[PDB]
Coordinates of C-alpha atoms in Angstrom, one line a residue:
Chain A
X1 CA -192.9 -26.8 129.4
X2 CA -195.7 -23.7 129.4
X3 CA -198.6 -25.0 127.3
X4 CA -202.0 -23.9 126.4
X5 CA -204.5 -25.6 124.3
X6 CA -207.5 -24.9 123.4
X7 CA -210.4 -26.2 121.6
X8 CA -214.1 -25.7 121.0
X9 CA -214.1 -23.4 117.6
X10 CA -216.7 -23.4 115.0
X11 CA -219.4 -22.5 113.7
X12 CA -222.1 -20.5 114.5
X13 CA -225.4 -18.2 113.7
X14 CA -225.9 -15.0 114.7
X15 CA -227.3 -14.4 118.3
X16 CA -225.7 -18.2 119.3
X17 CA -223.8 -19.4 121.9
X18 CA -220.3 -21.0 121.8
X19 CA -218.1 -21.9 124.5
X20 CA -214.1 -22.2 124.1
X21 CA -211.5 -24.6 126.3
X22 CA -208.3 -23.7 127.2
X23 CA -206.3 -26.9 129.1
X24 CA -202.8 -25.5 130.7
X25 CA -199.7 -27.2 131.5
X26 CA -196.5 -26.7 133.0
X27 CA -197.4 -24.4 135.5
X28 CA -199.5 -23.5 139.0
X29 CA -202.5 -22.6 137.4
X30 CA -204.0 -20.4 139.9
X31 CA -201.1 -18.7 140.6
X32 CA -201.3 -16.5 137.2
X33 CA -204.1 -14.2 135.8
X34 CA -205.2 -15.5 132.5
X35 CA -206.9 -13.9 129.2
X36 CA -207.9 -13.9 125.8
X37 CA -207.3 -12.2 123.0
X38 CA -208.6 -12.3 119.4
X39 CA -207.3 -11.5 115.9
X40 CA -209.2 -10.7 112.7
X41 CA -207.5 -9.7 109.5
X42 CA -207.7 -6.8 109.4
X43 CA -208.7 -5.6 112.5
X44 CA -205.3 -6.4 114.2
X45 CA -205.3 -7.9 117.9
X46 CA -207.9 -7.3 120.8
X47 CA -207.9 -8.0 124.1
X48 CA -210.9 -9.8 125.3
X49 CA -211.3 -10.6 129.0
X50 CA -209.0 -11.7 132.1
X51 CA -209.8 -13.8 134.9
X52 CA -207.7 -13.8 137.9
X53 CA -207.9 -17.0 139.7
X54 CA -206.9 -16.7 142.8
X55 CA -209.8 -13.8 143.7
X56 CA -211.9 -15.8 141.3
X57 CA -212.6 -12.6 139.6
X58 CA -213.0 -11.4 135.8
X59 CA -213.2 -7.9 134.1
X60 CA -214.1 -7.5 130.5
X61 CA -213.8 -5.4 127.7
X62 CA -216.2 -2.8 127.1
X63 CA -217.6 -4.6 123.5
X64 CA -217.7 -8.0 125.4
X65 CA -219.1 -7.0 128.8
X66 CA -222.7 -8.1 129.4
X67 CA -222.4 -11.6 126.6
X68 CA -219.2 -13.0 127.6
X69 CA -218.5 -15.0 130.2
X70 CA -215.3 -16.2 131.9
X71 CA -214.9 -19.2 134.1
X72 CA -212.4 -21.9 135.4
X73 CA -212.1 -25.3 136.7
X74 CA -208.9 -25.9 138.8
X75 CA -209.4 -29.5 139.0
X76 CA -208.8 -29.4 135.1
X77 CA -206.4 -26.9 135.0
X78 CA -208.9 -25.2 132.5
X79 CA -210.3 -21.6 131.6
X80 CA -213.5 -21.1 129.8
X81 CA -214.6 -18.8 127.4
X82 CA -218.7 -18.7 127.3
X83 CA -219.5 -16.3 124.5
X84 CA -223.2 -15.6 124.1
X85 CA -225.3 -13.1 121.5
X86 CA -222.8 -13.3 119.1
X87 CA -222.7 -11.1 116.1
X88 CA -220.6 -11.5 112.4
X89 CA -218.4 -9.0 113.6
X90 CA -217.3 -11.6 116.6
X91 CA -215.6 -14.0 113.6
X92 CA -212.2 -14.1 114.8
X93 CA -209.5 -16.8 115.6
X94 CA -209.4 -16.5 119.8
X95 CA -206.2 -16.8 121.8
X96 CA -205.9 -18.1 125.3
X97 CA -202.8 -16.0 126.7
X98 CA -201.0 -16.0 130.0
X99 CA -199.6 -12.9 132.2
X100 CA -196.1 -13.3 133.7
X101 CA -197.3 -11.6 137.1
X102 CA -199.1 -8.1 138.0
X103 CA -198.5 -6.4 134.7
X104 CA -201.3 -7.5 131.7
X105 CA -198.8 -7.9 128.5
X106 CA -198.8 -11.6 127.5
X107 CA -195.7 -14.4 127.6
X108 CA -197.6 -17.6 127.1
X109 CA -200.4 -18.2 124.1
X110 CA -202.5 -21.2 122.9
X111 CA -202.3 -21.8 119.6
X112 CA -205.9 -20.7 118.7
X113 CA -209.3 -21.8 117.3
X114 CA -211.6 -20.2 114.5
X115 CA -214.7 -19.3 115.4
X116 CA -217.3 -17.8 112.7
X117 CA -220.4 -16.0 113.1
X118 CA -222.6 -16.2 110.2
X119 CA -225.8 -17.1 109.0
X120 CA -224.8 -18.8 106.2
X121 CA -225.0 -22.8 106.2
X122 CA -222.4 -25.2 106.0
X123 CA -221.5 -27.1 102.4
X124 CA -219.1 -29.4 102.0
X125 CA -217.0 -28.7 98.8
X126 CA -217.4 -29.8 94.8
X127 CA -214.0 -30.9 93.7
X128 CA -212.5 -30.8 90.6
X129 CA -209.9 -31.9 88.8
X130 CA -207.4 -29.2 86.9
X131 CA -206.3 -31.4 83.9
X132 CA -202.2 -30.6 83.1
X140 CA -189.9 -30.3 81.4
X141 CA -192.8 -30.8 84.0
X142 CA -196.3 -30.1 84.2
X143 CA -198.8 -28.5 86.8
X144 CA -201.9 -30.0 87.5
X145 CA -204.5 -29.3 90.4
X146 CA -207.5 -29.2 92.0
X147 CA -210.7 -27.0 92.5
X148 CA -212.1 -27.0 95.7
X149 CA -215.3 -24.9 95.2
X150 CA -218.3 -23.6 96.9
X151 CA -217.6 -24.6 100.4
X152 CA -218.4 -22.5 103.4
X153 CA -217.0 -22.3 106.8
X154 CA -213.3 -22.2 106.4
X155 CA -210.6 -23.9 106.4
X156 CA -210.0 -26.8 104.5
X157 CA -207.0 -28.7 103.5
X158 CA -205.4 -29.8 100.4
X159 CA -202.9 -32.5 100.1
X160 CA -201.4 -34.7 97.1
X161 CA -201.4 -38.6 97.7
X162 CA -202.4 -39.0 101.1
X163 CA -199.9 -36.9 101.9
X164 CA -196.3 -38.6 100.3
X165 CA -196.2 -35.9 97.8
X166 CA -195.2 -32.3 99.5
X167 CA -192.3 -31.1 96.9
X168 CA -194.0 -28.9 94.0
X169 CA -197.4 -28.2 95.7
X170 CA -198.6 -25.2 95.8
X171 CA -202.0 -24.8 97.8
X172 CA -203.9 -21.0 97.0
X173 CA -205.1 -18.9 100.1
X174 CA -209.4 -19.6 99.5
X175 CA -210.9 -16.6 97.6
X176 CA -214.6 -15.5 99.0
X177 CA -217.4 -15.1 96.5
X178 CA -220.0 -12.8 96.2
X179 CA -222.1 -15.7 97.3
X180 CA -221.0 -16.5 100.5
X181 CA -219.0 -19.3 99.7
X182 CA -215.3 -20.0 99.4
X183 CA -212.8 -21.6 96.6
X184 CA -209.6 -22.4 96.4
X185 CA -207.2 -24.5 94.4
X186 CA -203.8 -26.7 94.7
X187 CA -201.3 -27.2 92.2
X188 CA -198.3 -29.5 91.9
X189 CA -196.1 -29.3 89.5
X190 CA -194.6 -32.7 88.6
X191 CA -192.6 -34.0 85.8
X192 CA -194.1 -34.4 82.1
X193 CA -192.7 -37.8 81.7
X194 CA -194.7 -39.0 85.3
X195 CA -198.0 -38.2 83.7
X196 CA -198.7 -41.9 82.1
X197 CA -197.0 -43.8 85.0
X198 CA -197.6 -41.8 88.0
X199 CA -201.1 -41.1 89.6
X200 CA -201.5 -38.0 91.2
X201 CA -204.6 -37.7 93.5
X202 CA -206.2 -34.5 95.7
X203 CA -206.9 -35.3 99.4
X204 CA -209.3 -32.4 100.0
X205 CA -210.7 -32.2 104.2
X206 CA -213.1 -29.7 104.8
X207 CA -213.6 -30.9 108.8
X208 CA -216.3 -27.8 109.2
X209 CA -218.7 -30.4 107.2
X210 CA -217.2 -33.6 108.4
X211 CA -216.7 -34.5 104.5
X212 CA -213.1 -35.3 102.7
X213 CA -212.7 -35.6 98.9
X214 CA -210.2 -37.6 96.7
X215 CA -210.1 -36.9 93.2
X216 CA -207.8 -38.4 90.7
X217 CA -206.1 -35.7 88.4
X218 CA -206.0 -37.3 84.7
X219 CA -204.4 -36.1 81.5
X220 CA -207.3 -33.9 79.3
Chain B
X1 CA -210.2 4.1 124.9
X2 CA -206.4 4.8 124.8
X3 CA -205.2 5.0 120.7
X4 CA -201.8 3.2 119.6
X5 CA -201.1 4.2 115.9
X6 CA -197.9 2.4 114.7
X7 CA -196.4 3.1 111.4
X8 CA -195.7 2.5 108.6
X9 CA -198.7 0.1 108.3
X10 CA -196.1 -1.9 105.8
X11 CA -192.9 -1.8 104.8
X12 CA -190.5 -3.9 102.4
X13 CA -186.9 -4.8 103.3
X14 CA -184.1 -7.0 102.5
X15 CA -181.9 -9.1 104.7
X16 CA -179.4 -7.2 106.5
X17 CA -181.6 -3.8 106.7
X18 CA -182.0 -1.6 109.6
X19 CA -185.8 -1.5 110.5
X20 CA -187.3 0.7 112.7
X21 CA -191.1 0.7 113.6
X22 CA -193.2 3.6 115.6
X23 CA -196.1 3.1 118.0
X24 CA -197.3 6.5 119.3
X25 CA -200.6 6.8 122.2
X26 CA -202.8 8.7 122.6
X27 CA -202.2 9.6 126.1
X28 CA -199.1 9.0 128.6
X29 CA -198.9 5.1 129.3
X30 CA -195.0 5.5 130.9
X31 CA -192.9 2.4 130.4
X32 CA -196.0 0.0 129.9
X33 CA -195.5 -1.1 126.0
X34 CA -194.8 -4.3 124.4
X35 CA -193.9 -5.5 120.8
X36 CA -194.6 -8.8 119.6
X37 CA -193.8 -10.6 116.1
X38 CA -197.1 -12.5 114.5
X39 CA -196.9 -15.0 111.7
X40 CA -199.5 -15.8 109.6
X41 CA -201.9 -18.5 111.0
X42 CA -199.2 -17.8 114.1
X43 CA -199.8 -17.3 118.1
X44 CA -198.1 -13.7 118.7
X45 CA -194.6 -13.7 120.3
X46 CA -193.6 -11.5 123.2
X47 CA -190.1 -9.7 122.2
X48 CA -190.2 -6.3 124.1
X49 CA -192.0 -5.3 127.6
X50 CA -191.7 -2.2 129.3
X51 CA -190.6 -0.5 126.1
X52 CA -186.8 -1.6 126.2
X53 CA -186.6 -4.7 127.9
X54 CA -185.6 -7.4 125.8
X55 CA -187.7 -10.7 126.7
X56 CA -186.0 -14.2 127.3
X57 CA -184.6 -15.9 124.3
X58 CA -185.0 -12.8 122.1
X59 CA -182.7 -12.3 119.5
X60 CA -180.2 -9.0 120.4
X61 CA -180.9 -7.5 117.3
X62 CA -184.4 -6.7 118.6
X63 CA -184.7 -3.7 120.8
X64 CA -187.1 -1.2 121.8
X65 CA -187.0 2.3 123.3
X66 CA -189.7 5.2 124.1
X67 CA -191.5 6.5 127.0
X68 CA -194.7 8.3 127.4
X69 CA -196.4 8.4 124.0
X70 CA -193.2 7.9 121.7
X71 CA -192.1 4.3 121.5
X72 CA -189.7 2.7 119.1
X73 CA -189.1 -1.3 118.4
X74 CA -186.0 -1.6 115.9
X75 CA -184.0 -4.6 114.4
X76 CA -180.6 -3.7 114.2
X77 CA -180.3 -6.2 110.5
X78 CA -183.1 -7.9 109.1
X79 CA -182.5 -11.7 109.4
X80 CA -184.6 -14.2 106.9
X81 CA -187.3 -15.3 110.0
X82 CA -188.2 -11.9 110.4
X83 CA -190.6 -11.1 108.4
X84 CA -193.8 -10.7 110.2
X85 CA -196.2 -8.4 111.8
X86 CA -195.0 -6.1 114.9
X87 CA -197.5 -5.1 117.3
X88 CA -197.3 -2.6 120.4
X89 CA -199.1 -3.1 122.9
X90 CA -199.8 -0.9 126.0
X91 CA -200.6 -2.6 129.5
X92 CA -200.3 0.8 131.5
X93 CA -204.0 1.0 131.9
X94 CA -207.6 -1.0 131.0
X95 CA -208.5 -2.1 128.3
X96 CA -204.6 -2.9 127.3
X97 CA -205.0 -1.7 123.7
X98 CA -202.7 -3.0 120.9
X99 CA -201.6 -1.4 118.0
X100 CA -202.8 -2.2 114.4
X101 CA -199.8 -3.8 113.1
X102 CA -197.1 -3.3 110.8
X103 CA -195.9 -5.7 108.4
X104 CA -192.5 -6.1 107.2
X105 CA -192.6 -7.5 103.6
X106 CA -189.7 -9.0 101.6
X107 CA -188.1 -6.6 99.1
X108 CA -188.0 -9.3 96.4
X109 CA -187.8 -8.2 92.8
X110 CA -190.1 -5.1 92.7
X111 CA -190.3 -4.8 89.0
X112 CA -191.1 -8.4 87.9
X113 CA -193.8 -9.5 86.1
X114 CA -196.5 -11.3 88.1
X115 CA -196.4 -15.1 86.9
X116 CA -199.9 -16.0 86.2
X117 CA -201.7 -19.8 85.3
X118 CA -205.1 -19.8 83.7
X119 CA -206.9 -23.2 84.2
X120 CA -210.1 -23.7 81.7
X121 CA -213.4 -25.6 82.9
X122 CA -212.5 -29.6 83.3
X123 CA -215.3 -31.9 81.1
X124 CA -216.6 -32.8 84.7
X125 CA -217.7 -29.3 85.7
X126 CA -219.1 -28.6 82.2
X127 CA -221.2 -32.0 83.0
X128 CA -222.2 -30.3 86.0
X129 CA -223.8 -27.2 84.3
X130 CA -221.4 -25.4 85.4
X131 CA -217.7 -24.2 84.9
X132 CA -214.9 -21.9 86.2
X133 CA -211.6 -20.3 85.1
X134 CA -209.4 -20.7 87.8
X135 CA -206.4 -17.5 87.4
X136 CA -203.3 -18.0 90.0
X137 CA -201.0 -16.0 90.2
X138 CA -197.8 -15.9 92.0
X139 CA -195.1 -12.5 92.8
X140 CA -191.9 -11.9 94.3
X141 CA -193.5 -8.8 95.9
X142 CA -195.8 -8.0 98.0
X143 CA -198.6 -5.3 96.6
X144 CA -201.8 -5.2 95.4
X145 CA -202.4 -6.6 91.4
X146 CA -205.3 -5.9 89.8
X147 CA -206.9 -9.1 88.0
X148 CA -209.2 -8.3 84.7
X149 CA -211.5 -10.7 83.0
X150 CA -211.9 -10.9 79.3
X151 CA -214.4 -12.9 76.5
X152 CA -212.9 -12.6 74.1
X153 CA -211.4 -8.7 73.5
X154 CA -214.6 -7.7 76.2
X155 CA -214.0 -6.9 79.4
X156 CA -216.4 -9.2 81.9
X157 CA -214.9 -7.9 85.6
X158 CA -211.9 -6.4 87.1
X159 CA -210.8 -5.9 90.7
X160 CA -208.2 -5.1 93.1
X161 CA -207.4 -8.0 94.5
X162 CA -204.5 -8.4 97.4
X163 CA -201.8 -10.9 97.5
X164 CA -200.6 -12.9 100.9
X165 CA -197.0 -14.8 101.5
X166 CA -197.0 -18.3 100.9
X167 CA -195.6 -21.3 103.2
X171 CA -190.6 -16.9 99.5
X172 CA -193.3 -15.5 96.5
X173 CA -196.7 -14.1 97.6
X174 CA -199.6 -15.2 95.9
X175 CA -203.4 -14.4 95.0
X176 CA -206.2 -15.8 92.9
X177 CA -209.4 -15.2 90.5
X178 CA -212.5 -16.8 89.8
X179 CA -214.4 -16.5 87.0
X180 CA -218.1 -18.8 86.7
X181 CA -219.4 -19.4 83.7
X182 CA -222.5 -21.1 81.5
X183 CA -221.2 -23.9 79.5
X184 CA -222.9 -22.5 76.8
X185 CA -220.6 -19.4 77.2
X186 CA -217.6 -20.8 77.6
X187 CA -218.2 -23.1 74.4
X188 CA -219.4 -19.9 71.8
X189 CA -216.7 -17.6 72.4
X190 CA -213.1 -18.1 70.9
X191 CA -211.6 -17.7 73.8
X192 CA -211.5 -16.1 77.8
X193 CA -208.9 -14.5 79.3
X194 CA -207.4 -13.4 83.0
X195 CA -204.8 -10.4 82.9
X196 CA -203.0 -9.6 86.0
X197 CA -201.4 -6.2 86.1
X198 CA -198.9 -4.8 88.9
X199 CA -197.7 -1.3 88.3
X200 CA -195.8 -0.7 85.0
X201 CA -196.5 -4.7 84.7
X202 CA -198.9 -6.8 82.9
X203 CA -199.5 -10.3 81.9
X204 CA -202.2 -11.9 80.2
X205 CA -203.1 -15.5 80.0
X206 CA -205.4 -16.5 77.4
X207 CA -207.5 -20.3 77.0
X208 CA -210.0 -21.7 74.2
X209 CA -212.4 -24.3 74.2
X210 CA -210.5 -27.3 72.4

């Protein structure tokens, strides 16, 4: 019934600006002060900001005071997150989160948007295919930057056996990863198995077609 | 500005254990502390507010206690869709600080050998001036391995490299680049993946 979603994550340099969406649902939006929170491996959970809407006020957290910048639009049913000067250190997938009444501990959540600071630019991913009782094949999805992307066998048809690696970050800047399925030895002349690689950060998707060496 | 330390910052279980997790502040925030369960790529989940109240549709075997700066979540026996990240939270006063976290890790088989796949450079990357050995690696527990790199007998690189739980075994990978050139002179390369008193070594050859 309670929803939140949000939107508006990204990409972005150092000292831009990014703003984030959060549409709610299911309940009178004014009547409830609202918030958000981010989370960084590593660094755990942080509370960001609240905006009460019914005095149409906002306080911040000390770190965020001064660059970020609440706002709603009732008509929409939608709270804004305007987030200017950022910094590397602001990377961070950011939560739009609901409190029950008076007290500021949270019972509804959206379900989060990436948002990277860096000055790196994007690239779209070199794919490549990992050549093979059964037998594991794959693909390498190299030298991409900003996460995520997303591996999947066959359009999607083929789920059973895959096994998709969290990406790795280089020295460089720039992240790989690979997918594996393992599929039976006797497929491997009759079957064709093909990676669906989406890297929606660079508007770019890959197929590659896995053959025997 | 008010500090909320949990611990342990991990811990491994088994279905059917007793776990129980500590926040401590750094000053008196009362009764205003919650818990909540995160999974991985996951929104958090309220379980606990003012330290012992058990929220709506929360499992009994969740429960919390504490007051002051000593606070307490605890589940009575570990059930398989617990394992997770607890936070505590305080809401007493600005700026409504949250603890660091404490992950609770499946047991699995502690002594096991990490099971490790070496992939060599396909024909295409070679084409491409390029190549990579591609090491994966996959455990059923959840520390730290250390991944080295070998040409030949010769060590090339070696790091600490952290696992993660996958959509159950957790998993981790290594890269290594190379000239094609280098990966065509030498006899062979090879990843080796050690975990404690463990080791396993994966070897491939340009054929």
């Amino acid at each position: 019934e309670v929803q939140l979603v949000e939107s508006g994550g990204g990409l972005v340099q150092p000292g831009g600006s990014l703003r984030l969406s959060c549409a709610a649902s299911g309940f009178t939006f004014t009547d409830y002060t609202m918030d958000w929170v981010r989370y960084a491996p590593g660094k755990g959970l942080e509370w960001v900001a609240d905006v009460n809407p019914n005095s149409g006020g906002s306080i911040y957290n000390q770190r965020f005071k001064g660059r970020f910048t609440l706002s709603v639009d009732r008509s929409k049913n939608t709270l804004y997150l305007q987030m200017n000067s950022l910094r590397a250190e602001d990377t961070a997938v950011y939560y739009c989160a609901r409190n029950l009444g008076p007290s500021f501990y949270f019972d509804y959540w959206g379900q989060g948007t990436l948002v990277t600071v860096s000055s790196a630019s994007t690239k779209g991913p070199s794919v490549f295919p990992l050549a093979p009782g059964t037998a594991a094949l794959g693909c390498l999805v190299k030298d991409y930057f900003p996460e995520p992307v997303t591996v999947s066998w066959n359009s999607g048809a083929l789920t059973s056996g895959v096994h998709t690696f969290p990406a790795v970050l280089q020295s460089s800047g720039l992240y790989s990863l690979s997918s594996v399925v393992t599929v039976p030895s006797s497929s491997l002349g009759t079957q064709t198995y093909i990676c669906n690689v989406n890297h929606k950060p660079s508007n770019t998707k890959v197929d590659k077609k896995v053959e025997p060496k | 500005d008010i500090q909320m330390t949990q611990s342990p910052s991990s811990l491994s279980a088994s279905v059917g254990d007793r776990v129980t997790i500590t926040c401590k502040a750094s000053q008196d925030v009362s009764i205003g502390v919650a818990w909540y369960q995160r999974k991985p790529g996951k929104a958090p989940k309220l379980l606990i507010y003012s330290a012992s109240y058990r929220y709506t549709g929360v499992p009994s075997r969740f429960s919390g206690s504490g007051s002051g700066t000593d606070f307490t979540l605890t589940i009575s026996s570990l059930q398989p869709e617990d394992f997770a990240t607890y936070y505590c939270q305080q809401y007493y006063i600005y700026p409504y600080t949250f603890g660091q976290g404490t992950k609770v890790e499946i047991k699995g088989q502690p002594k096991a050998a990490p099971s490790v796949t070496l992939f060599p450079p396909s024909s295409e990357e070679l084409q491409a001036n390029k190549a990579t050995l591609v090491c994966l690696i996959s455990d059923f527990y959840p520390g730290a391995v250390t991944v080295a790199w070998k040409a030949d007998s010769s060590p090339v690189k070696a790091g600490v490299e952290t696992t993660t739980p996958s959509k159950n075994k957790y998993a981790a990978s290594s890269y290594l680049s190379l000239t094609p050139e280098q990966w065509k002179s030498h006899r062979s390369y090879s990843c080796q993946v050690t975990h404690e008193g463990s080791t396993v070594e994966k070897t491939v050859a340009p054929t």
